[PDB]
Symmetry: D2
């Protein structure tokens, strides 16, 4: 029987998944995806590509109704009629959105056709993760919608400029993405919440801090300068893991982001210093200048500018630590290639190989000293650079 | 070891998939999908939803370039710069597109960083299937993009009319979808190619034709099979092919432009081409089977009822209306049948219908269900046989 | 849960087994055995070796009670008390033998503690297969019981003689096994039934008869001489598969075996000719002289004698076809190595590699022309030999 | 492909076995065994039953030669002729034995036709485990070989007496097994080594000692634990090791020859050695736990009852008899607990007992079951706690 076979497959894959770590589970999940694609019929492939786009449209509707937050707090299964009446939604519309949501595990449907939270329901109720989904709907989707015609119009160029990519046609403007976003109040607020989403694991899981420090002394220097550090999660985790390391630990960002960070920052030990990383770096001779998920959002020439603003502040002991994606030369996975297409369409930037990172840093007069990977199989690493 | 466990999982699923039929493989594929969603991390969920949308956009770029057709014809792996130079694409952009494509199996990357066709490559090179991908990008995507704020602005109504749903907001018009497409020279040609993609399997694989014929005579000159809105007439062709000795007229009904397009692929005899708008009374009297495949799902109840009412006065006691369409279950419906429901709600104002909802609709037309013959699994397509009440 | 895991393993292995042929199932079964051995604890290994010997002792008890034949014909589950009363067995003894039998699948026990036939029950009810089990108990077991002390007494020799191996000590006689068996009425009868067990598949599944024949003509020669052919299954299958091939087809065996074969032989087309294969072969110039599972039961010197009795009867077109086990040089499996130990202990003989077969046939002046394997992964093959 | 499917099965089972505990692995192993029996052909069944008996005989030969101990010590693979020449075995015979051994994993054959130790090699080199294999060959095998014709000759009786079962026919004597072994200089030494094999896990892994102590005082000088027929005293050693601070005498009771043999391995203090035949009244009064591990299963009901009756008059209200033994289920019992039942029936006239049969036996001694603490799965061994009625 196929239902018996299918239940047995689920049981054994679940038992294998439970017995490995999060990296082994990510590898199993990538293999399940590749098996699905290789096994589908030609018609299934067209259907899958046609319909998987429903997921984020329906998630955005659930978010606007407050459905995922509400269902996450319910202690018992809820009927479609109870959800519809509580949330201000038409009853037949609510019933057919829940039926779609249950079919892709956005919620769970019970045997008596009621609804409970799934793991995905809990995810979409988290503010930072909800904001990532809403960001995909309102900012990424229109740009991907414009990419095919944009490339055809321009005879398939190598996109290298943030001010002439798919973004400009999608939103009918000559501004680049980041500047245009800063003039849109509702989108600014959503990105503010997006910053509260802390990625796990982080670089401190594999970064050999003591061996990189060596005999460095804080005789009143900065140990860690978090450039564009957002909520300062890197500073918070650093002070939490090495609470007796001397040296200033400084969060650098724009004033509005720094204000939103004050609530969750510790009252002691981490300075909030407003700084635009398109300007010369004010902190001189720091041990670590840290750039996490910054340079991936800029083309080569402006990513170079950012590093050139830091280099004149470095001493011989100073290091620029680039914490970012490092996809492989071969066999890159969908999370790191889909990234690449999205940031080319919206920002004109790109993901870069280890060899691509080294070539960019050499234009700044830097040399790679060490690379400390901390996620698998999609590669994120802390890359430590020195003066040439 | 982690690599060897992954490779062992792949080998065992492959072997199990090879050990069953297409319905068993579709069930396995749905199970693998369920497993993925249940095992992803919270961040993976958001990433998956953010990035899976790239597949349709990049497929449209590859279709614009003719990449899929070209690589399908290739006998040896090709480098990114060979592909770029041949198709007229920037070398950097081509390498980035191929890397993404390979990551989602839209093509395959070899150990030497060259590229081969995959099953998906082959699929996207087929014109009828290519056209469904292009239809989803240019027609379905804008409607889904407009749906959330349409529902918000309108305070989440129950959509029931084809001229007031998300489609009107998405394309800034007041026509319904089918009217509007007819006035669009840009998009009609793709819809015409879409009719050429014959779905497999079809209802004849399980339809007990001889049993359903029962006490019915083709004499003197009666119609066996009237295929209402039959498009290219696939149903008529497969019917004559499977039952070449059964007497009776076999009639393809559609609009004159579609019938003209069907002439190239119809047999020279045995199948009549009859122009007929199914919003008017059915002209063929007393046929055995009045056949409607994937017609009624595109209409709200009121218009779907009128289409059935156009047929009923032509029926004799031994006539049957055969509705060949999706029949999702009361619970546990699959993503392919719920996804379609959202899409046709947003574009057409219509809906998928359960067996009970089909019977309720047909009751208003004075019909009763005599039999239901499923022919796909686990997503249910079925030939439903209705008679006069 | 372990019961859910264990049920899922069963489901998936069963589905894989159903989807291959009998050779793939044999390979899966060998892998399950090797996995069991590698996974057991040290205590499990001693227990397994201690207790798996119960299986054939309890099978012999079930055979003597007629239990397997009786249960094979029952249309409903039977209680231990009903089986005990019907078969003339003590009720508590019957209950604990059935509990042991059910634990090793010799029968199946139901949820309400009744008993039904298993696949193994049906097997043990077949006369020829029952006789194989009874043969293992009464003839093989005592010889294996004597092998360790026999080898120690004699300082671990290379056993090469049928008249001085473990058999002589086990049954306290100086006769060789076959001669001693012929003086034991009850054992003669059991081997008579053992001959009715036809092995499947057989050599005709892969033997290219027409291409081996070539232009041979029966102008009034024998096509097939089945030497020690037993019930003549090889002759029956040959006439059934090639019913229009001209040439005599002759079953050669001892008179008592030939009598028992007459019942099941066709009335036409197969001659029954009494012949002792330790004597010169009477049929001259036949196309195929066929020896299936004969030479494995003799040491080299008497296996050579048997072939030397046939060679002077051959023409240039004649072939000796040895149908027997051909184990590999490396990675031989338990069915073909356990064989080897048993026949060395009882008969002084051995299994032989392809290279070992060629060297034996060369002493007879024969050369291997072709080898047609027909079972996997345990190798049985029809080996075709020509005059040197 | 058939090879790759086999290799994938092996990898997945290995990974599942590694992903659970020893009890999960024992369940997996029983499942693999069930699968094999259900998937074998009729001819395979007969072959398996014919040939699996070779394993014990060949293990005994390897033990006689010291093969398992030698290969266990070896740092590199060894050829058959190196092994033959070193152990004093004919080169032909050695190669044939090793080929068979490798086929059942008793050692492993390398790709270059050389031989390494396996887990089973290691096992058979351990003296206590070696001794169980030798015991099965020389003591159990002759009794099983005599059982069928013994039952036939005697018209299939219910065996209930230790001096009239298959053992008397197998060894042509009228003594019971335990008496007869004591008069056999050949076989006593192996039985002595058998006592040194400590089973794992043991009852202390789940026994809630502090809970069972309850309202009981070691003062003034009471006994915590009396291990009746305790052999080498493993139970006493592990008890003092796990509960080093719990007060009370810990007493090992056995026959003087076994106690002498236990002296080498006992701690210098904390455990008393008390000669005592458990067929006589128990001398230690008012102990908390009177412990009987794998004692009573070797006796028919009548003698097992007498052993319990020897203990009851020594008990106080807070005293408990702890029977540590096998407790097979009412249905679905495993081969390791049913196989033992046949073996001890044939040699000792005794039996395995379900929980209900244990309670019935103890009721005749005036005892009631207070608690049962299982410590192995799926084959059930349990510490059963009995109190006065
Ligand atoms: C990827 S987000 C947060 C990255 C941060 N390193 C982390 O891992 O959480 C990029 C950050 O850069 C900040 N940013 C953007 N433009 C900036 C600028 N010109 N100067 C300083 N920070 C800027 C944003 O406020 C945002 O917090
Ligand atoms: C889903 S498509 C083809 C369905 C077809 N039965 C099949 O299974 O291939 C719907 C068909 O209905 C036709 N159609 C649309 N409106 C129609 C009308 N008013 N009268 C007749 N046919 C119509 C279209 O031309 C198209 O061929
Ligand atoms: C392995 S059994 C049957 C083999 C037979 N080729 C088959 O495949 O069924 C061996 C046969 O050889 C026969 N046999 C034993 N000694 C013989 C002899 N001296 N002359 C002729 N046949 C003999 C026995 O009667 C028995 O039928
Ligand atoms: C199964 S062995 C050892 C059991 C021990 N409780 C254990 O778990 O290791 C049985 C023990 O009972 C002892 N024994 C046999 N007869 C006895 C008797 N009459 N009185 C006391 N001990 C006896 C033997 O010496 C042997 O040590
Ligand atoms: Cl026909
Ligand atoms: Cl303690």
């Amino acid at each position: 029987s196929n239902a018996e076979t299918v239940a047995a497959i689920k049981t054994l894959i679940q038992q294998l998944a439970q017995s490995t770590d999060q990296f082994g589970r990510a590898e199993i999940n990538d293999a399940l995806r590749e098996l699905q694609y290789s096994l589908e019929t030609p018609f299934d492939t067209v259907m899958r590509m046609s319909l998987d786009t429903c997921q984020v449209a329906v998630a955005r509707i659930g978010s606007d109704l407050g459905l995922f937050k509400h269902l996450s707090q319910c202690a018992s299964p809820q009927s479609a009629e109870e959800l519809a009446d509580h949330l201000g939604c038409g009853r037949e519309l609510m019933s057919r959105l829940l039926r779609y949501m249950a079919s892709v595990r956005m919620v769970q449907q019970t045997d008596d056709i009621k609804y409970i939270s799934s793991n995905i329901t809990q995810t979409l109720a988290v503010p930072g993760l909800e904001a990532g989904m809403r960001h995909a709907f309102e900012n990424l989707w229109p740009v991907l919608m414009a990419l095919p015609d944009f490339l055809a119009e321009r005879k398939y160029p190598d996109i290298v400029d943030a001010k002439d990519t798919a973004f400009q046609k999608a939103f009918n403007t000559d501004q680049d993405c980041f500047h245009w976003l800063a003039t849109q109040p509702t989108r600014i607020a959503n990105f503010k919440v997006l910053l509260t989403d802390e990625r796990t694991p982080n670089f401190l899981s594999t970064f050999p801090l003591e061996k990189e420090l060596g005999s460095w002394s804080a005789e009143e220097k900065a140990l860690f300068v978090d450039i564009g550090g957002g909520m300062g999660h890197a500073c918070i985790r650093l002070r939490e893991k090495y609470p007796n390391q001397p040296g200033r630990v400084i969060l650098q960002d724009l004033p509005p982001v720094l204000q939103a960070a004050q609530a969750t920052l510790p009252l002691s030990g981490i300075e909030s210093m407003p700084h635009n990383f398109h300007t010369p770096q004010p902190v001189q001779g720091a041990k670590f200048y840290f750039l996490r998920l910054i340079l991936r959002d800029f083309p080569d020439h402006q990513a170079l500018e950012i590093l050139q603003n830091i280099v004149p502040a470095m001493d011989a002991e100073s290091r620029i630590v680039i914490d970012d994606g490092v996809p492989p030369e071969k066999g890159a996975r969908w999370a790191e290639t889909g990234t690449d297409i999205c940031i080319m369409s919206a920002l004109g930037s790109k993901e870069r190989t280890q060899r691509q990172w080294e070539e960019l840093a050499a234009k700044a007069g830097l040399q790679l000293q060490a690379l400390y990977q901390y996620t698998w199989p999609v590669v994120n690493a802390a890359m430590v650079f020195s003066l040439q």
